[PDB]
Design a protein around this ligand. Sequence first.
Ligand code: NZA
Lengths: 259, 252
Amino acid sequence: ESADLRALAKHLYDSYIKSFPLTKAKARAILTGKTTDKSPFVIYDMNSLMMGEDKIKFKEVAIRIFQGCQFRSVEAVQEITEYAKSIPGFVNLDLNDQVTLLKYGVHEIIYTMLASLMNKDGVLISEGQGFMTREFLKSLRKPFGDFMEPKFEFAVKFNALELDDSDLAIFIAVIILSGDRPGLLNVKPIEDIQDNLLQALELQLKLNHPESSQLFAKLLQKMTDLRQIVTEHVQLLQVIKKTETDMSLHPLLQEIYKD
Amino acid sequence: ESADLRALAKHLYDSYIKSFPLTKAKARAILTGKTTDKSPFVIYDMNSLMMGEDKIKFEVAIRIFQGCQFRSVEAVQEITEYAKSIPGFVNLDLNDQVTLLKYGVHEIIYTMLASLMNKDGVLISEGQGFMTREFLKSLRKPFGDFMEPKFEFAVKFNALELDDSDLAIFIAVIILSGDRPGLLNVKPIEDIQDNLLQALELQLKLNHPESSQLFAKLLQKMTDLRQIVTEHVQLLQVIKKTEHPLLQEIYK
Ligand SMILES: O=C(O)c1c(Sc2ccccc2)c2cc(Cl)ccc2n1Cc1ccc(Cl)cc1
């Protein structure tokens, strides 16, 4: 029945609101100039980089950003995990599976919501207080100049679909409850929920975006882009783990990463 | 007007059946042997336990309370789904919704843990098990005292013979407690609790006419509930001193 799906859309939107303080809609207000939010201090060079500790709340310059990006990730992990817990069925699954959905589905979800924070020119940082240009990032040191660039490439392809937060919440769920991830014990109950999530999404996109022909297919097809950018990341991470054996990864991120 | 409260009373009860798979009527049948159709595997000492993972699919004392937490999390989800059926619950400020559940869940979980409990132990795994109280008292410290206070409370609580139709309005009242720290807009909250309480007060009289001042005795147990949770949280404090990083994060 329609009504059962649209009621599941409501439920997940609501959890998404309750688990993610910087929504895409908050993000876009800041990035355009609406008077519902005030303005970001742009960081675009080492000079601005250094009023940045003064103005907005917050060792090589390139690495200090990394360990900042890395701390943001763990907060984002902490946040997606809370959102999964609301996904009907998820907590009832086997527990070894729950950790395997999270461990693999987390990064794909990061880079999806990181797109809400990005436009062609840069990325909000610090709960929106900051904004860091794409040009600054790509100009950093020879391992680090290439970390956020393919994130940007995806985000501009992705943001063109013009999803709002309420669509995103359902698409986030499908991502989590995949069923094709390595090491799952009972894929069938997973697949059964994801079938329900896909149904919900399918309806939701047709209702929210009635002129957007085949947005469902175009949405789901972007699950390929995400996969590939997780792959470049992991590989790129292991380079600096031995360029700077000085630098440390936080334990929960450590667990996520199982080469 | 009493029609609305009788109407609220069944709207909640129906929502409670949809939200909670294992009801007190259901449990009660299993405990008393009345419904002989199925009989729960019982875990009375060590060797019954290791045998129990085979029958009911899921150190020893650690694995036990660890499984005790997995079900809390499941239960929280069933509570949350129920909450959203309470008239006007979803109409409140999303922050106030999160705060009512943040502080309300534990009180509700021991309440419905009481439906699962008699003098001698507690039903486990959707009732397909029964773990003896004496087996859980034999656990290592601090684990041998964990469920002992809860057992104490359930016997007193189960002594007010409440049914699921009662508990349905009761626990609603727990959730609309306007004194949870950090609320932003309390009027609507207290506005719903004063409605739940009217409906609970009527429900107690009609369902328990011979039970004198039961309303009052129910409201007094909410002292024993709050005291229980306080007592619970800081034993999880001293278990943070005795014992995947992904797992710790699912369990907050
Ligand atoms: O998942 C279960 O059914 C369960 C469990 S899980 C378990 C089963 C066997 C050995 C260790 C843990 C449980 C454990 C204890 Cl010490 C007390 C009550 C327990 N239960 C029953 C329970 C039901 C509901 C809620 Cl809210 C919390 C607990």
